[PDB]
Design a protein around this ligand. Sequence first.
Ligand SMILES: CNCCCC[C@H](N)C(=O)O
Length: 214
Amino acid sequence: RDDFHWEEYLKETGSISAPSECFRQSQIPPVNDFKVGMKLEARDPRNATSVCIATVIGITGARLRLRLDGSDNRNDFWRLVDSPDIQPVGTCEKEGDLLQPPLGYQMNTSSWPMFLLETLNGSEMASATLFKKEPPKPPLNNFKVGMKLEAIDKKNPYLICPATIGDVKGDEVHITFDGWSGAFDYWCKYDSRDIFPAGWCRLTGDVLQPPGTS
Ligand SMILES: CNCCCC[C@H](N)C(=O)O
């Protein structure tokens, strides 16, 4: 929403936003120089032990909409340019591993070797320079109940929404989405890369969803 401005929203709701130091997100957001069509390696979101070739389908703020080469277009996922889950082509090999076909590979398994060559042939492989350094983990869990922040809706990952810490337990926090039912609530580690300080979308040029209408 064009009207949503944190300073005003905080005033209105009589709330405070979690300080930037609570998050495992860089004080100065990483720069996103990726381009649509670039190739990179990404851990298969539906098969963690696999590293696959991914193509940048879209760009949004400091995030990349990715699709695993050879799979359908219904399992796209979003990753920060400083996410540990993505890396330049060639990394997998250097960490003693082999690239695998995606879980949703649409061709026969035996076709993988030639498909890999074909999909990378004359393609634009994102340079190591585009991959940013992950922020260090905040030493402690400094989140307090009631603090507001921006969080990814894990049921609809493209969405970053105004959220509130509903609970704190050990190194985890209970995320609740403002204006929506508990149907989208979830627990995550306080250093999750899926939560961000108020103002993140504004600084990175990403899309912050407007609060819901509860
Ligand atoms: C907390 N964000 C929730 C978004 C829900 C969007 C979905 N299309 C629906 O209307 O259910």
